[PDB]
Ligand binder design. Structure first.
Ligand SMILES: CCCCCCCCCCCCCCCCCC(=O)OC[C@H](COP(=O)([O-])OCC(O)COP(=O)([O-])OC[C@@H](COC(=O)CCCCCCCCCCCCCCCCC)OC(=O)CCCCCCCCCCCCCCCCC)OC(=O)CCCCCCCCCCCCCCCCC
Ligand SMILES: CCCCCCCCCCCCCCCCCC(=O)OC[C@H](COP(=O)([O-])OCC(O)COP(=O)([O-])OC[C@@H](COC(=O)CCCCCCCCCCCCCCCCC)OC(=O)CCCCCCCCCCCCCCCCC)OC(=O)CCCCCCCCCCCCCCCCC
Ligand SMILES: CCCCCCCCCCCCCCCCCC(=O)OC[C@H](COP(=O)([O-])OCC(O)COP(=O)([O-])OC[C@@H](COC(=O)CCCCCCCCCCCCCCCCC)OC(=O)CCCCCCCCCCCCCCCCC)OC(=O)CCCCCCCCCCCCCCCCC
Ligand SMILES: CCCCCCCCCCCCCCCCCC(=O)O[C@@H](COC(=O)CCCCCCCCCCCCCCC)COP(=O)(O)OCC[N+](C)(C)C
Ligand SMILES: CCCCCCCCCCCCCCCCCCCC(=O)O[C@H](COC(=O)CCCCCCCCCCCCCC)COP(=O)(O)OCCN
Ligand SMILES: CCCCCCCCCCCCCCCCCCCC(=O)O[C@H](COC(=O)CCCCCCCCCCCCCC)COP(=O)(O)OCCN
Ligand SMILES: CCCCCCCCCCCCCCCCCCCC(=O)O[C@H](COC(=O)CCCCCCCCCCCCCC)COP(=O)(O)OCCN
Ligand SMILES: CCCCCCCCCCCCCCCCCCCC(=O)O[C@H](COC(=O)CCCCCCCCCCCCCC)COP(=O)(O)OCCN
Ligand SMILES: CCCCCCCCCCCCCCCCCCCC(=O)O[C@H](COC(=O)CCCCCCCCCCCCCC)COP(=O)(O)OCCN
Lengths: 375, 205, 438, 63, 161, 82, 111
């Protein structure tokens, strides 16, 4: 009964915070800092390893910028889904955790849209939903055929690999990210383009869910880079950058380089935080540079880990593609830098809510030298 | 050397050889050998057989491109308005022509590659260059001035790129290990492994 | 060495704490202090230590810094030429960008780790995009050109560094490693191919120089082109000698073709800055070929010629900047009568142009002689090819001088006290090197 | 309909193998499918209430 | 040398009035200066933010454009655009995403017409625009019922909501 | 006044060409649904495909790149006719 | 109509409101020409008038490729002569197909 207590504590904690927030709901404290702190303390009870500690760090940072009890509760639900995804041992754990996370995305997207923004937000949420239903239905149908043929539910199968490919958003399963994340709030797009990835990478690495095929990462790298170069809108540039990078990361993760993907996801989170939560031109420039991979910033270390892993596998086509695609991506990032300081006078809203943004910019600048041992 | 008096780098004796020493006491390989299918398809002995084995790829790519274009045309056409013309009659040429052209170009490339390799008798870069050049010549039969020069070049270059980074690269850098002692330098005192690291199990998908 | 590195780290640091009105004075004093520290580094460098004069490590392979013959000359050149750039630039933003670029470049020269070298040299990538693409006097095209060319070449170099770090286990120069791989050699080579402009990868340089400020152009031609020779001597020849010997006919073809095509292209130029930029591209070819011969005569000759160029090209770019400030034109056709109207500017211009043509009393002569001797050591035809085509430089320089020298002009456009002060160190250094104190 | 088909396949497999795994996956499908439908229908109603006068077949995206 | 100085004209002399038909159908007299682009004149007058959309070009999103109907006689004053450049890509994108079916042969964008003396008493009308989205902040639901002014928007253009 | 690039073409002809992009726009969901469905089935089928030579793969990629038509291209040229 | 802007004593002030034009650095600027400016623009933007014609291809190939071929052939000849002169075995160059592995001469060995 003692092993069960560890899991039970999380539920008890979430329920009591939920009912406390409901009972103590008032206009005087719309930003429930106390509940945010209780949720952060609660999520420390699920840290068991280093990946769980990274999941906690990212969830806490995401929770800081959500406003209101409701949004923070749905982030805790996302965290619970992510924690269970890492521990999934068969098809049922994978399906259950990922579909719960999809539900939390649908709610978070819906509750962060203004009345004037409902026409486009609800359309993008509906398109995301229908595509998610296609993915889940094909997954469960194939899983049923596999369970019937083999008699057992084994997470080492092509069915799970293709499903996790959809979840990562590589090859041709990246369009939901483009459609949904363009029409949603900047914070929601940022937290759901980084945090979910860690769980999928952990599942792939731990459950041996790798394929010999390199076509999907090669496709994601080239499509993402070319689409980033041809995209007029800045949201699309940022969205396609993640497609390209996660394609390369997928290629690296299939070959067993788990440590490098777990370090990359953390650096990418810190790099994306300042560009997405744009308030200052300088913070945004340092973020764009880190995503680009410029050497003085922590982004260089993250890209270096992936490139270093690529040279070990000794696949020439991947290295050539990587160099050319990286150059094409660099042109898009230069476009972003040009738009801020070299095109026209820029005036932005004074949204002075830089919770972890200053810390992230500092961590990007300063972190390169401490983490130099990795590369 | 980092000096201005003597040539940089070094010289290695050609007479003196170093007896090969195994990287580890026991070698476990997680890399599977080529399949019998791969060798069968790669066999260029009979040009007709080689061509017919490798065209499925070109046909598939042509079908995907034709399906893409046909869908784009179909999506725009309005369901609510009745159309006098038959949509399939309009759309079927798109797909058929794209598939046929793609298959023809891939057949030309595979045929010329096999025929040159047989006539020359050696596996060489030239075979790919001449197959690409012939495909690009067929592509640019009626195109304006620049295209006859550009397409034979781009097409000839593509097999060069494939050969350099698909065949020469891996064989060239097979020896490098990354663990234990550097391949060339085994005298140096570095930790010696009993077994090679197995970072992943042999794939099966 | 430690004093030089500390002063280097203090110069960007000082700007954060200055009054914003004392910025120029503080920056000049810091530049002079960095020059004095470089002189101290030279004093503390004993010739008895033949391999590396001094090596310092601060806890990791990345923080390994050291000075050799090439490194010492380039570092002294950077410290000598930086004060001129500082005085020519006005504004806190411009000072900040320039000081960051200089710190990154000066740290790259002394770095002995390939990955650290890459980290330091390519840090100054956005700063050049912003500098060359400034609001009124900059061109976005030039910024994009230089940035993309640098990113692609440095990424190839980075991939080669990653393979060397994986295979050998270290990428520090101080550890003797040899590689026969051609992919890795090409990766390291492509950076050198682009950074030191070699046909057909030289297009980025002229655009950047024309649309860069005079301080930027002076820094670029003076030392940024030299960073290739440090990479060759420190990070290419020790490990990839076999590939340079294997590809010597191709290397020679590309270097001679660069020298010829660049010389011919200089003939069609109507802008003074473009003329100076294409002259630099032509001059880089001899240095590259001489180093590739992997002979004592070649490495010394290449470094010496690099110093001579790093003393002659900043002078021409400075005079061109002064003239443009006086007249707001760089077109040779609009500039006439400069002999009569600017006898003092003209004298220095003629002197520097004579230096660019490798006349005997100039450092270029001695350097060229040594480089030609190295080529003649390889083959007599190699030397002859380079010697013969040198006349093309004479034709363009003579035509430019003749157009500028005479005509009718109604404007007195001569240098002020500040302009003479800025070139006097360069003139004295040119004279001293010319007389044999190389 | 598709999710129901897959759940039926799981129940069929459970009967074939005398195993409870399919019955639990199938109850999971029933729960998740109903939650997904409820949320999607809420989104559809919200989308329809915000339609501008010009828009005609707002619900029919595939038109 | 030393020719006669030309004294500048007063604003009264260089103000031209244009009759602009709005979406609701009301006609407004928009006084404008000669030499100003139509987009700026329309923005200053005080039309709502719904009536204007950012120029959908790689580096032109700061400019606010409007779909306008120009009489056949004033087509000459519209500016030529090179197809092989990116200004054409801007115009094509704005037609594809904003105008769509509501296109007419008289349809043009305000930025590409510059007001001149010969455009006095010109009647222009706002052309219908389809719902468009760039960022959540920069979008059009399709309801022209906000009573703000495009002038009162300090933010220059779209980036990240 | 400053020197400017000459624009090929007449103003009204270029504007007319640009106006051929202003046509009813389909929603991208319709394309995405089919691409997702077929892509999933394609990924399942790809595991069973025979191993192809790198040269053949690269040539197929080249042919696919050349034969790919951008969505804008069809949009501009689409005519509802036989 | 003109006045001296510069003051050696250091009491320099810009009289922005002076009726008389200051003799500042702008006094000595050279007057531009409408036609010269257009020539400069045309010369720099000469890529617009580039056209792929057989004459252009011929000229490019004959001078650029021709020089590159001549230079490669000369370098190969010089390398062959040096190898014969030095007494070294035929070196394995990149494009040369040689059944010998010789590249760098051994310093210890006597050739
Ligand atoms: C104080 C001592 C700390 C020193 C060591 C820490 C270990 C002891 C833990 C002690 C706690 C200190 C926390 C520090 C580390 C956190 C780890 C941890 O806690 O669990 C590990 C530990 C055992 O796991 P393990 O040591 O990792 O080894 C397991 C296996 O080896 C398998 O695990 P593995 O993954 O480590 O396997 C080895 C791995 C090798 O893995 C590694 O080498 C890891 C490298 C370390 C990097 C550290 C950064 C990670 C970020 C997380 C930050 C910590 C957040 C703290 C969260 C918990 C707070 C307590 O090899 C791999 O290849 C796997 C890949 C690993 C990921 C790749 C690493 C890259 C990370 C990203 C870096 C990228 C840079 C980004 C920015 C950098 C800028 C500088 O678990 C425990 O001891 C029990 C957990 C208890 C935690 C909370 C319980 C106490 C409170 C109970 C009730 C709470 C409610 C009341 C609240 C009270 C307050 C209000
Ligand atoms: C203990 C006893 C005390 C003794 C002191 C010892 C303490 C040691 C260090 C303490 C010194 C304070 C550190 C300064 C922090 C703030 C600096 C800053 O904001 O820069 C501009 C700022 C000028 O401010 P401002 O003129 O009043 O207007 C700025 C407005 O806020 C916004 O103006 P805007 O919107 O118009 O932006 C225009 C922008 C034009 O737009 C751009 O160009 C954007 C480009 C993106 C970044 C540039 C990429 C390349 C940068 C390369 C790094 C430079 C060093 C090169 C060496 C290679 C290193 C690998 O141009 C600029 O901002 C300046 C251009 C060049 C500066 C870029 C260098 C800054 C890099 C990151 C700054 C650190 C921020 C951390 C944030 C912390 C919490 C938020 O400071 C400067 O004076 C120049 C930069 C000084 C650089 C030293 C900082 C260290 C960074 C090097 C990385 C090495 C790792 C760090 C270890 C350092 C030692 C442990
Ligand atoms: C019935 C439903 C209808 C669909 C039919 C089938 C349904 C799908 C079933 C299965 C789908 C999975 C596999 C299909 C392909 C995977 C792509 C995908 O699914 O993404 C979702 C994609 C839509 O995603 P999206 O994010 O919404 O659209 C992003 C674009 O911006 C879209 O915006 P955009 O279209 O307006 O912009 C297009 C842009 C987008 O850019 C791309 O397409 C990037 C793709 C580049 C290569 C992709 C990786 C290649 C690696 C293939 C791996 C296998 C080979 C292994 C080794 C090869 C080494 C490379 O590219 C272009 O600008 C046009 C040029 C085309 C390629 C550019 C490269 C040219 C290089 C040739 C050099 C010759 C020029 C020399 C002369 C030049 C003079 C200076 O859906 C499709 O496009 C599926 C249509 C299927 C047609 C593909 C044709 C052949 C397929 C295999 C050949 C591999 C090359 C790929 C070529 C084009 C693919 C897009
Ligand atoms: C070895 C470390 C390096 C590895 C990195 C990962 C490890 C992380 C180590 C340090 C983490 C530091 C995280 C920095 C967060 C920055 C602090 C912060 O975000 O404060 C917010 C907090 O905002 C909130 O929402 C408060 C809600 C909760 C408050 C904190 C919760 C505390 C819970 C307990 C945490 C203890 C951990 C439990 C056991 C480990 C305040 O910002 P705002 O007021 O919203 O806006 C700022 C406005 N302006 C700056 C412009 C003036
Ligand atoms: C990035 C590389 C792409 C090539 C770029 C070249 C310019 C593109 C123009 C398109 C032309 C098609 C590609 C031709 C390049 C191959 C070089 C031709 C030399 C040649 O024909 O010899 C072959 C071997 O060379 C070879 O095939 C191996 C040589 C490797 C190519 C050159 C590598 C460095 C080039 C990079 C320069 C700058 C990079 C920027 C692109 C024959 O050999 P054989 O064995 O058949 O003997 C014959 C026994 N039958
Ligand atoms: C009374 C006041 C006089 C006023 C003006 C006179 C100025 C100085 C006059 C004489 C001083 C000459 C020193 C200048 C440079 C000489 C350097 C030198 O030749 O020694 C090298 C030291 O190594 C090194 O690495 C030295 C590096 C530093 C040298 C300077 C680098 C360039 C800096 C800017 C150029 C300005 C130079 C002045 C080794 O020489 P060796 O081993 O090759 O054998 C020598 C035969 N060649
Ligand atoms: C397995 C793979 C098989 C091969 C497949 C290859 C497929 C494509 C590979 C190409 C990768 C090269 C990346 C450079 C692309 C060229 C630059 C983009 C052109 C361009 O318009 O850039 C503009 C300025 O760029 C500039 O001004 C830059 C001028 C040109 C840069 C020169 C490139 C560097 C040197 C090239 C090679 C050097 C060594 C190679 C080893 C900025 O456009 P915008 O911001 O306005 O965007 C608005 C959208 N139009
Ligand atoms: C056509 C003229 C060539 C243009 C180059 C002119 C001068 C460049 C010389 C650079 C000096 C060192 C570079 C080493 C080799 C590069 C080019 C040498 C010529 C060459 O292509 O030889 C090939 C072998 O090289 C290779 O296999 C590698 C070729 C380079 C790869 C291209 C891109 C690689 C980028 C990789 C980035 C970092 C990767 C690090 C893992 C084939 O010659 P062969 O011996 O087969 O003779 C068979 C002919 N019958
Ligand atoms: C599409 C792109 C290209 C299309 C157009 C290309 C047209 C160019 C064709 C001719 C160009 C010049 C001729 C040089 C190559 C001739 C044939 C190459 C074969 C060859 O190496 O023969 C050697 C030629 O003599 C030599 O060693 C070189 C003699 C000519 C060099 C001097 C001529 C001009 C001098 C100008 C300065 C250039 C070089 C500066 C160093 C002598 O045979 P072998 O005894 O070596 O036996 C070696 C085994 N075949």
């Amino acid at each position: 009964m003692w092993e069960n207590l560890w899991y039970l504590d999380i539920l008890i904690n979430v329920l009591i915070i939920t009912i406390f927030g409901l009972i103590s709901c008032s206009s005087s404290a719309t930003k429930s800092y106390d509940l945010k702190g209780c949720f952060i303390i609660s999520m420390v009870g699920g840290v068991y390893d280093i990946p769980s500690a990274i999941l906690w760090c990212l969830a806490s940072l995401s929770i800081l910028n959500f406003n209101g009890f409701f949004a923070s509760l749905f982030l805790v639900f996302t965290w619970i889904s992510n924690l269970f995804a890492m521990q999934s041992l068969n098809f049922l754990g994978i399906y259950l955790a990922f579909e719960m996370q999809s539900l939390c995305l649908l709610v978070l997207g819906k509750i962060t849209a203004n009345e004037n923004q409902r026409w486009f937000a609800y359309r993008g949420l509906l398109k995301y939903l229908v595509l998610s239903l296609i993915a889940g239905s094909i997954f469960i149908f194939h899983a049923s055929s596999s369970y019937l043929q083999s008699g057992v539910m084994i997470s080492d199968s092509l069915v799970t690999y293709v499903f996790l490919l959809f979840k990562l958003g590589v090859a041709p399963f990246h369009m939901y990210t483009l459609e949904l994340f363009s029409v949603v709030s900047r914070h929601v797009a940022f937290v759901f383009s980084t945090l979910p990835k860690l769980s999928v990478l952990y599942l792939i690495s731990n459950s041996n869910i790798g394929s010999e095929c390199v076509w999907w990462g090669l496709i994601s790298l080239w499509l993402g880079s070319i689409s980033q170069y041809q995209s007029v809108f800045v949201r699309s540039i940022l969205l396609y950058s993640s497609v390209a990078e996660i394609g390369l990361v997928l290629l690296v993760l299939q070959e067993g380089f788990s440590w490098e993907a777990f370090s990359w996801v953390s650096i990418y989170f810190l790099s994306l935080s300042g560009v997405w939560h744009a308030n200052s031109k300088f913070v945004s420039a340092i973020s764009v540079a880190s995503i680009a991979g410029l050497p003085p910033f922590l982004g260089f270390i993250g890209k270096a880990q992936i490139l270093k892993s690529l040279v070990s596998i000794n696949l020439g086509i991947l290295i050539f593609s990587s160099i050319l695609a990286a150059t094409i991506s660099f042109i898009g990032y230069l476009r972003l830098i040009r738009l801020m300081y070299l095109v026209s006078p820029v005036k932005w809203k004074n949204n002075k809510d830089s919770s972890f943004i200053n810390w992230s910019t500092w961590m990007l600048t300063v972190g390169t030298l401490p983490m130099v041992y990795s590369v | 050397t980092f000096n201005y008096v003597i040539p940089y780098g070094g010289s290695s004796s050609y007479t003196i050889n170093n007896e090969p020493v195994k990287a580890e006491e026991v070698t476990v390989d997680f890399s599977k050998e080529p399949s019998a299918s791969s060798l069968k398809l790669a066999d260029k002995s009979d040009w007709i057989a080689y061509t017919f084995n490798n065209v499925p790829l070109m046909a598939t790519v042509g079908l995907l491109a034709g399906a893409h274009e046909a869908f784009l045309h179909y999506e725009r056409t309005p369901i609510y308005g009745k159309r006098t013309y038959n949509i399939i009659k309009k759309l079927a040429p798109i797909v058929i022509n794209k598939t046929a052209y793609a298959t023809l170009l891939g057949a030309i490339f595979c045929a010329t590659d096999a025929l040159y390799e047989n006539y020359s008798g050696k596996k060489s870069y030239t075979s790919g260059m001449v197959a690409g050049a012939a495909t690009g010549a067929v592509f640019a039969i009626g195109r304006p001035l620049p295209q006859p020069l550009v397409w034979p070049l781009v097409f000839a270059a593509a097999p060069v790129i494939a050969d350099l980074f698909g065949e020469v690269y891996p064989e060239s850098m097979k020896s490098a290990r990354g663990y234990g002692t550097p391949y060339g330098f085994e005298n140096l005192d570095d930790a010696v492994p009993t077994r090679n690291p197995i970072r992943r199990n042999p794939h099966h998908y | 060495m430690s004093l030089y590195l500390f002063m280097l780290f203090l110069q960007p640091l000082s700007l954060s704490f200055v009054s914003r009105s004392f910025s120029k004075i503080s920056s000049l004093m810091m530049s002079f202090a960095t020059l004095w520290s470089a002189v101290y580094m030279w004093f503390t460098s004993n010739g008895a230590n033949q391999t590396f004069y001094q090596v310092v490590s601060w806890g990791s392979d990345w923080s390994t810094f050291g000075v050799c013959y090439t490194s010492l000359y380039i570092s002294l050149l950077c410290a000598f030429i930086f004060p001129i750039c500082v005085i020519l630039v006005q504004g806190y933003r411009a000072l900040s960008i320039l000081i960051c670029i200089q710190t990154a470049v000066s740290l790259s020269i002394v770095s002995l780790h390939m990955l650290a070298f890459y980290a330091l040299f390519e840090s100054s990538l956005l700063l050049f995009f912003i500098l060359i693409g400034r609001r009124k006097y900059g061109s976005l095209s030039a910024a994009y050109n230089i940035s993309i060319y640098t990113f692609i070449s440095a990424l190839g170099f980075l991939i080669s560094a990653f393979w060397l770090n994986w295979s050998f286990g270290s990428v520090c120069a101080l550890l003797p490693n040899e590689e026969a791989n051609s992919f890795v050699a090409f990766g390291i080579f492509i950076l050198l191919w682009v950074k030191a402009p070699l046909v057909p990868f030289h297009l980025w340089l002229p655009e950047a120089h024309v649309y860069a400020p005079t301080a930027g152009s002076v820094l670029l031609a003076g030392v940024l082109l030299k960073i290739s020779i440090v990479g060759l001597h420190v990070f290419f020849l020790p490990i990839c000698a076999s590939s340079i010997v294997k590809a010597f006919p191709l290397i020679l073809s590309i270097c001679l073709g660069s020298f010829i095509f660049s010389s011919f292209s200089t003939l069609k130029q109507i802008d003074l800055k473009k003329i100076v930029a294409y002259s630099s591209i032509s001059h880089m070819a001899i240095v590259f070929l001489s180093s590739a011969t992997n002979s004592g005569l070649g490495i010394q000759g290449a470094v010496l010629y690099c110093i001579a160029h790093g003393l002659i090209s900043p002078g021409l770019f400075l005079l061109v900047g002064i003239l443009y400030k006086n007249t707001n034109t760089k077109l040779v056709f609009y500039l006439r009568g400069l002999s009569q109207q600017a006898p003092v500017w003209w004298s220095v211009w003629v002197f520097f142009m004579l230096g660019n043509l490798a006349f005997p009393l100039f450092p270029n002569f001695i350097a060229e002689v040594v480089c030609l001797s190295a080529l003649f050591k390889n083959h007599e035809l190699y030397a002859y090819a380079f010697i013969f085509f040198s006349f093309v430089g004479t034709v363009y320089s003579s035509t430019v001088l003749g157009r500028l020298k005479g005509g009718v002009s109604s404007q007195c456009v001569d240098a002020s006290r500040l302009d003479v002060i800025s070139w006097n160190p360069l003139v004295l250094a040119t004279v001293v090197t010319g007389i044999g104190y190389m | 309909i598709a999710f129901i088909a897959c759940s039926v396949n799981f129940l069929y497999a459970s009967a074939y193998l005398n195993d409870m795994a399919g019955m639990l996956f199938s109850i999971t499908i029933t729960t998740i499918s109903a939650c997904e439908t409820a949320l999607g229908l809420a989104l559809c109603v919200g989308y329809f209430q915000s339609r501008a006068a010009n828009e005609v077949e707002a619900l029919n995206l595939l038109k | 040398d030393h020719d006669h100085y030309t004294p500048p004209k007063t604003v009264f002399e260089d103000t031209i009035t244009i009759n602009v038909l709005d979406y609701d159908g009301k006609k407004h007299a928009v006084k404008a200066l000669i030499g100003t682009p139509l987009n700026k004149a329309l923005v200053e007058y005080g039309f709502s933010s719904t009536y204007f959309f950012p120029n959908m070009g790689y580096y032109t999103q700061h400019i606010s454009d409007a779909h306008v109907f120009i009489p056949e006689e004033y087509w000459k004053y519209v500016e030529n655009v090179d197809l092989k450049t990116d200004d054409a890509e801007a115009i094509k994108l704005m037609f594809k995403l904003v105008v769509q079916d509501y296109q007419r042969e008289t349809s043009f964008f305000a930025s590409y017409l510059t007001l001149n003396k010969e455009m006095d008493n010109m009647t222009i009308g706002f052309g219908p625009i389809k719902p468009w989205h760039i960022t959540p902040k920069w979008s059009f639901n399709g309801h022209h019922n906000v009573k703000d002014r495009m002038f009162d928007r300090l933010e220059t253009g779209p980036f990240i909501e | 006044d400053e020197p400017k690039h000459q624009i090929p073409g007449n103003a009204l002809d270029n504007w007319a060409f640009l106006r051929t992009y202003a046509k009813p726009l389909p929603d991208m969901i319709h394309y995405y649904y089919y691409v997702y469905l077929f892509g999933f089935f394609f990924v399942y089928k790809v595991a069973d495909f025979p191993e192809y030579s790198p040269r053949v793969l690269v040539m197929a990629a080249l042919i696919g790149s050349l034969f790919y038509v951008r969505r804008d291209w069809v949009h501009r040229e689409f005519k509802d006719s036989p | 109509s003109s006045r001296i802007a510069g003051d050696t004593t250091g009491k320099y002030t810009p009289n922005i409101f002076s009726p008389e034009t200051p003799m500042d650095r702008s006094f000595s600027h050279v007057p531009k020409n409408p036609f010269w400016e257009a020539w400069v623009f045309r010369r720099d933007n000469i890529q617009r008038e580039f056209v792929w014609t057989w004459q252009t291809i011929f000229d490019l190939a004959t001078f650029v490729g021709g020089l590159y071929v001549a230079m490669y052939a000369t370098a190969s000849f010089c390398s062959r002569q040096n190898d014969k002169r030095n007494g070294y075995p035929e070196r394995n160059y990149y494009f040369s197909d040689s059944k010998s592995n010789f590249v760098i001469p051994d310093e210890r060995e006597f050739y």
